Amino acid sequence: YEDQVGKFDWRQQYVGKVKFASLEFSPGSKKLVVATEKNVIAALNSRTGEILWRHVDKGTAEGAVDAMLLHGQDVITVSNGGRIMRSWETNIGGLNWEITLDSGSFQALGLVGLQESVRYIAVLKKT
Amino acid sequence: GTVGLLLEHSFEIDDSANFRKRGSLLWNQQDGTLSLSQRQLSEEERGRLRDVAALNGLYRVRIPRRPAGGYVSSFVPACSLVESHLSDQLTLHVDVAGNVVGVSVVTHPGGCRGHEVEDVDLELFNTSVQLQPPTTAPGPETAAFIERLEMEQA
Amino acid sequence: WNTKARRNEFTVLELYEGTEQYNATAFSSLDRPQLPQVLQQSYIFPSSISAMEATITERGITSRHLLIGLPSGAILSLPKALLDPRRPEIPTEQSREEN
Amino acid sequence: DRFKIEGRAVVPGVKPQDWISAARVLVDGEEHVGFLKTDGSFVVHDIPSGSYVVEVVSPAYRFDPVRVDITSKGKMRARYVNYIKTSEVVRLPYPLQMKSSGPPSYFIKRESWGWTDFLMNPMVMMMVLPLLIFVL
Numbered sequence: 320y321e322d323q324v325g326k327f328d329w330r331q332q333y334v335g336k337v338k339f340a341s342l343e344f345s346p347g348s349k350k351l352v353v354a355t356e357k358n359v360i361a362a363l364n365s366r367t368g369e370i371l372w373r374h375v376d377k378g379t380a381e382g383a384v385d386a387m388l389l390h391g392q393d394v395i396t397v398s399n400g401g402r403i404m405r406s407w408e409t410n411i412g413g414l415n416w417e418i419t420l421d422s423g424s425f426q427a428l429g430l431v432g433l434q435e436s437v438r439y440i441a442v443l444k445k446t
Numbered sequence: 447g448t449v450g451l452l453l454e455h456s457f458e459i460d461d462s463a464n465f466r467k468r469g470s471l472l473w474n475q476q477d478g479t480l481s482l483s484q485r486q487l488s489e490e491e492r493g494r495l496r497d498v499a500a501l502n503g504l505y506r507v508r509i510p511r512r513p514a515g516g517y518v519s520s521f522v523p524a525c526s527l528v529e530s531h532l533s534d535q536l537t538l539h540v541d542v543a544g545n546v547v548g549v550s551v552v553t554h555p556g557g558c559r560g561h562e563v564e565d566v567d568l569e570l571f572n573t574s575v576q577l578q579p580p581t582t583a584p585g586p587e588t589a590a591f592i593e594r595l596e597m598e599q600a
Numbered sequence: 601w602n603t604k605a606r607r608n609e610f611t612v613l614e615l616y617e618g619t620e621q622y623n624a625t626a627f628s629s630l631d632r633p634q635l636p637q638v639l640q641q642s643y644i645f646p647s648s649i650s651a652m653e654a655t656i657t658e659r660g661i662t663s664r665h666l667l668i669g670l671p672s673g674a675i676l677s678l679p680k681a682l683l684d685p686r687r688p689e690i691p692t693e694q695s696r697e698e699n
Numbered sequence: 700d701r702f703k704i705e706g707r708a709v710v711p712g713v714k715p716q717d718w719i720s721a722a723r724v725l726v727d728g729e730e731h732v733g734f735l736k737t738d739g740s741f742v743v744h745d746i747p748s749g750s751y752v753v754e755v756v757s758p759a760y761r762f763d764p765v766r767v768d769i770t771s772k773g774k775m776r777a778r779y780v781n782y783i784k785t786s787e788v789v790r791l792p793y794p795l796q797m798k799s800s801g802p803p804s805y806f807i808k809r810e811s812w813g814w815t816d817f818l819m820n821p822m823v824m825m826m827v828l829p830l831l832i833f834v835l
């Protein structure tokens with residue numbers, strides 16, 4: 320240490336191969352939300368390509384991202400074969416709600432609308 | 447009670463594998479003692495060991511894995527076997543579940559110093575046979591530390 | 601990991617020969633009839649671990665350190681001199697002489 | 700059968716929106732992981748019965764680990780970890796209020812010894828005692 324930061328050491332932040340990506344955002348938001356095969360959900364700065372907020376997960380398959388969708392400003396993810404569903408606030412860089420689901424293999428993820436606005440999530444498992 | 451394990455030796459000019467039966471090991475699992483009953487070397491075997499020693503060959507021991515499911519074997523410089531007056535020790539290492547793991551042979555003293563050896567020396571097998579079960583490693587010592595810190599606090 | 605007490609544990613094995621070396625000119629694995637004595641000691645590490653590798657210097661003059669890789673992401677530099685197995689359970693004059 | 704560990708985490712003087720971006724709650728050394736939501740609280744799911752040390756890892760501000768014992772029936776409790784004499788119990792409320800202890804101290808300050816430190820040199824005294832001996 321010795322408070323000689325950056326004189327000799329250097330760190331590089333790397334996410335894995337981009338399994339699922341989301342580019343749709345406000346023009347001034349300048350954000351990419353990407354979940355990789357390394358179980359990593361990260362936000363990349365559009366202008367320069369740097370990490371804004373990164374949330375790593377369990378190395379094993381028990382935390383693998385299986386489906387991403389984006390709505391408005393928060394990105395919604397499913398992990399551990401449909402066991403957990405999370406909502407991440409892309410601006411702050413944290414969760415909004417984390418909900419466990421019942422057993423059964425996840426097969427498809429989508430949104431629903433009542434009359435004019437999307438308000439619920441339809442998640443389908445094999446049963 | 448007692449289980450018998452075969453034990454073969456081999457030594458050749460070409461240092462190949464020509465294992466021949468040498469001795470039986472009576473491993474009594476109850477008291478954990480092992481005793482070997484080998485036959486003494488013959489004239490031709492003594493000669494073969496002499497040439498193997500001359501060429502700095504190897505003396506290989508081999509035992510079956512089970513009392514023909516496999517074998518566990520090792521080797522020792524045969525010229526060091528003959529320069530130690532046929533004084534050696536073979537240790538049988540097993541595991542916690544009581545399965546044969548390996549055999550390790552080593553002479554006494556090791557190495558070689560060019561000592562010429564007469565034939566009459568090689569009519570005895572001064573072999574020390576031991577069985578080595580896995581030694582339990584000690585866990586961290588907590589009682590001594592807590593009592594010592596209690597005395598320090600008081 | 602130690603399941604009985606639920607705590608990560610180290611265990612240092614140090615190999616020591618007798619007071620006099622068997623051979624100094626050269627070392628041969630075929631000429632080692634003396635089984636080296638083993639010194640063991642188990643310590644408690646208060647966190648998990650992810651990767652270890654000792655610090656290596658060209659001539660080995662510099663003391664040895666273990667680079668403990670914690671899950672948090674830090675890299676602890678644990679001194680190997682702390683993990684000595686000869687640290688007595690009761691200090692004596694010999695220990696004080698050796699510090 | 701499967702239970703969840705709840706809790707909170709607040710750093711005094713700093714809003715959560717500034718530090719929760721790169722903080723993870725670890726249940727027993729990465730064997731379970733969770734992420735803190737916007738307000739600062741955290742929830743970890745899929746926890747079987749046993750004993751687990753929960754720590755809020757964050758490079759900005761450290762957090763004191765807290766042990767949590769959950770039983771098969773469902774009752775579950777929190778306490779202070781102690782790897783020595785583990786039989787002790789020091790109860791801590793379950794809605795873990797793991798208040799931070801400020802930024803950690805990865806850095807060590809420079810020595811910057813002064814002349815007043817040079818004043819009482821053990822070497823100077825141990826080499827001037829012979830000087831008095833040399834005179835006498």
Ligand SMILES: *[C@@H]1O[C@H](CO)[C@@H](O[C@@H]2O[C@H](CO)[C@@H](O)[C@H](O)[C@H]2NC(C)=O)[C@H](O)[C@H]1NC(C)=O
Binds near residue numbers: 324
């Ligand atoms: C990691 O530590 C370094 C060093 O303490 C931080 O860099 C400091 O950032 C503050 C904030 O602007 C500056 O005032 C200091 O001058 C920086 N230090 C140096 C040596 O330049 C860095 O911000 C820390 N990283 C995080 C994510 O907090």
Ligand SMILES: *[C@@H]1O[C@H](CO)[C@@H](O[C@@H]2O[C@H](CO)[C@@H](O)[C@H](O)[C@H]2NC(C)=O)[C@H](O)[C@H]1NC(C)=O
Binds near residue numbers: 558627
């Ligand atoms: C140490 O081990 C060596 C190797 O087994 C012994 O043999 C010596 O090896 C060196 C290097 O090749 C030769 O120069 C010597 O001539 C060898 N000595 C003999 C007697 O042949 C060596 O003897 C061992 N040292 C001691 C003190 O026993």
Ligand SMILES: *[C@@H]1O[C@H](CO)[C@@H](O[C@@H]2O[C@H](CO)[C@@H](O)[C@H](O)[C@H]2NC(C)=O)[C@H](O)[C@H]1NC(C)=O
Binds near residue numbers: 533572574
């Ligand atoms: C038979 O082999 C044993 C080894 O198991 C020899 O015992 C060693 O003897 C030497 C001196 O003769 C001692 O320095 C060693 O300490 C002994 N070893 C053990 C383990 O006690 C024994 O001498 C050999 N017998 C003959 C006739 O050579």
